[PDB]
RNA sequence: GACGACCCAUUCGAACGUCUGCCCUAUCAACUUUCGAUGGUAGUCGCCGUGCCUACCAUGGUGACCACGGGUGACGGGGAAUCAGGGUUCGAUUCCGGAGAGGGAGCCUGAGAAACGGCUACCACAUCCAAGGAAGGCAGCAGGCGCGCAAAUUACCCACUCCCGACCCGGGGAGGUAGUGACGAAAAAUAACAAUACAGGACUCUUUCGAGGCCCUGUAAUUGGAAUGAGUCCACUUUAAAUCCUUUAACGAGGAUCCAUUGGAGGGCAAGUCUGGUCGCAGCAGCCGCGGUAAUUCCAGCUCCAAUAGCGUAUAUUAAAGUU
């Protein structure tokens, strides 16, 4: 149990690398503005966050 | 309060403050220079040495682990420093009797975390970073 | 030689309240980064500091007169302040948003020919506008009051007279 | 194209025997034309003929539409040929340089230094 | 007109002298004197004033208002970083003053030097030699070795700016120009617009359902029209000659590529009680703490968050510290 490389050398290695190109600079802020505030969805008090994979 | 507020007491103020400043811990290390003489560093951010031999270092309770450090002698002092090695499997990328580059933890004098007796870590083996060795965007140059 | 910074960073690294204001402000005007925001706010807070001196100086001190008179002229010349005001107290009533109205890309959209603000910035950079006789490529022109009645498209462009682009003449060939 | 030559702050510079102005030029759909073409037009605006005219400068602003330079016009040839920095005369040829690169001078100089009486070998001979 | 010379004045200075201003240390409190310490008298010397030096004579001078001694990774100042007010820290380094050219000493020339791109000697180095002798000092520009955590071309040129000479003409690694350059600073691209398609709010139309709808919105599907420099590149221009920049031919965008990364997602602190693997092992963790088979913190995948042509890490230091 002194052995190193243990946890990293017995884990599976997988990927699903992107084909889709993400935006930079201006447009990345444009989407951030619209998706949060100018949609306009919000409803009754909730905890949701901008992520939820629950 | 409880002290002079004269108009001609500049001497009694500026000589008192110059004495009671030495009771501060920080000030007393900076200006005596005993810091420099005692440290294995010259005040330099990094330093370079040559490996002596791998070791295993036990953890302080509650935590129990073996932490796989090294022990190193320096180029320019010849004295010995015990240095941590970062992420999993990076120990293997350090080979005995080669040069390394060391660096402090980020607490600037004191032992960090649950590992005692270690005050230094390792960043580059031989002009190549632990990152690129670990991630696999570079290979051993030998 | 001589160099200095034109912006400062916020003291707090994160703060839910702050970030939303900086985000939504950037959304309206099509700005690229917060560095384009903090730039404005440095200049403003500088002007707010100079004004804050002169109000505490004696009334009818010669220093206070000559500075204020020539200062307020400059604020009126760019059009962030009116001459129906014309005193130092209204400097402190000035705020961030009034500047941004006088930006080039804002004035293209507001008083000229554009779609959404995101379009208008691209037109400035792709050399399809001029300011009186002179091509520009800088959306941060900040535009003097007199020059608002000379904003026109360019005289060599496919927008108005001048040679077509390489999408049209390609398809012609 | 059709281009305009336009004056700007003339001086009758009697001491050097010349007339110096600015060469302010407008070009409509082009800009940045040869300097040779420019001095032709200035030849037939003061009738001084184009071999005593000399011009230089001519940086072109963004988007074209204007270019601005600096021009001299001498009364006679010999007043130019005397005064004139050499490279401006050689700019439209009548003079050259040689001489010859750089270095071959210094290495010869230090060799000439170490002889006395006769240095005619080193001046021709190495 | 040119040159030279004596003196006076002038200019550029040079040299001494006045008053005030200094970092740490008392586990440095008494210091200085015939090996002149302080003063008097006369003389020598020197460009001159003067214990500068010598003879004779006196016994003074300095200190708890910190002398004397020791230390300084101490050249000084004009300044720099941070900063409400008051401060703190740094100043090798482009301007000004000073000191020094391997370490010491002596000296020639000159108006000016105790000169080192002058000389002589000793000491420490190192080179050539026919062994008799001879020659040397990169803290000048480049360049090499060494030292280290740590730093560029043995490039081009007197055209600019100035200096030197008997000189309008000569010379200058001063200086200018280019190369290397993510120390650092300023500017601001990496897709904008319609069609269809779903989707939403005011609306308004309807009892509601539902439908329309333009101010919108993303989001799918393909596209369509339109635009531009990134690059490639003739010409002009630039300049000492050229590069770059600006200016202009001709090629140059359908998103699969003409590809944005660096860190983070338990709390402090903006963002996952998602999925797989590991099971106090391996590792993470500035700090508090995570891992003992159901891990929101480890190793990976997906998604999300922050800043962005930048971001992370180590160390010195300031603010936070009314914890000097």
UniProtKB/TrEMBL annotation, chain D:
Keywords: Ribonucleoprotein, Ribosomal protein. It holds the Pfam family Ribosomal_S24e. GO terms for cellular component: cytosolic ribosome; cytosolic small ribosomal subunit. GO terms for molecular function: structural constituent of ribosome. Residues 89-126 are annotated as: Disordered. InterPro entries: eRP_eS24_sf, Ribosomal_eS24, Ribosomal_eS24_CS, Ribosomal_uL23/eL15/eS24_sf. HAMAP family: Ribosomal_eS24. This is 40S ribosomal protein S24. It comes from Oryctolagus cuniculus.
């Amino acid at each position: 149990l002194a052995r190193v490389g243990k946890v990293r050398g017995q884990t599976l290695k997988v990927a699903k690398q992107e084909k889709k190109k993400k935006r930079t600079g201006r447009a990345k802020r444009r989407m951030q503005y619209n998706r949060r505030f100018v949609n306009v969805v919000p409803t009754f008090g909730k905890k949701k966050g901008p992520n939820a994979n629950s | 309060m409880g002290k002079c507020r004269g108009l001609r007491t500049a001497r009694k103020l500026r000589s008192h403050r110059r004495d009671q400043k030495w009771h501060d811990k920080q000030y007393k290390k900076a200006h005596l220079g005993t810091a420099l003489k005692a440290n294995p560093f010259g005040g330099a951010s990094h330093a370079k040495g040559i490996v002596l031999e791998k070791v295993g270092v036990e953890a302080k309770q509650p935590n129990s682990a073996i932490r796989k450090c090294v022990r190193v002698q320096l180029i320019k002092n010849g004295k010995k420093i015990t240095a941590f090695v970062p992420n999993d499997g990076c120990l293997n990328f350090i080979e005995e009797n080669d040069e390394v580059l060391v660096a402090g933890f980020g607490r600037k004098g004191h032992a960090v975390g649950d590992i005692p007796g270690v005050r230094f870590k390792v960043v580059k083996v031989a002009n190549v970073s632990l990152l690129a060795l670990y991630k696999g965007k570079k290979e051993r140059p030998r | 030689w001589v160099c200095r910074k034109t912006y400062v960073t916020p003291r707090r690294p994160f703060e839910k309240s702050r970030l939303d204001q900086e985000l939504k402000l950037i959304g309206e005007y099509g700005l690229r980064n917060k560095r384009e925001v903090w730039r404005v706010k440095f200049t403003l807070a500088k002007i707010r500091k100079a004004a804050r001196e002169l109000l505490t100086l004696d009334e009818k001190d010669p220093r206070r007169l000559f500075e204020g008179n020539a200062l307020l002229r400059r604020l009126v010349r760019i059009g962030v302040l009116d001459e129906g005001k014309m005193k130092l107290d209204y400097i402190l009533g000035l705020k961030i948003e009034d500047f941004l109205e006088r930006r080039l890309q804002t004035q293209v959209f507001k008083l000229g020919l554009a779609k959404s603000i995101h379009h208008a910035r691209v037109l400035i950079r792709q050399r399809h506008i001029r300011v009186r006789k002179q091509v520009v490529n800088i959306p941060s022109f900040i535009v003097r009051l007199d020059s608002q009645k000379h904003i026109d498209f360019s005289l060599r462009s496919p927008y108005g007279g001048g040679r077509p682009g390489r999408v049209k003449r390609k398809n012609a060939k | 194209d059709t281009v305009t030559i336009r004056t700007r702050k003339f001086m009758t510079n009697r001491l050097l025997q010349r007339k110096q102005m600015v060469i302010d030029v407008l070009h409509p759909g082009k800009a940045t034309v040869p300097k040779t073409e420019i001095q032709e037009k200035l030849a037939k605006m003061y009738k001084t003929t184009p071999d005593v005219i000399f011009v230089f400068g001519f940086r072109t602003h963004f988007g074209g539409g204007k270019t601005t330079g600096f021009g001299m016009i001498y009364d006679s040839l010999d007043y130019a040929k005397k005064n004139e920095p050499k490279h401006r005369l050689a700019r439209h040829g009548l003079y050259e340089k040689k001489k010859t690169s750089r270095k071959q001078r210094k290495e010869r100089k230090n060799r000439m230094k170490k002889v006395r009486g006769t240095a005619k070998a080193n001046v021709g001979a190495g």
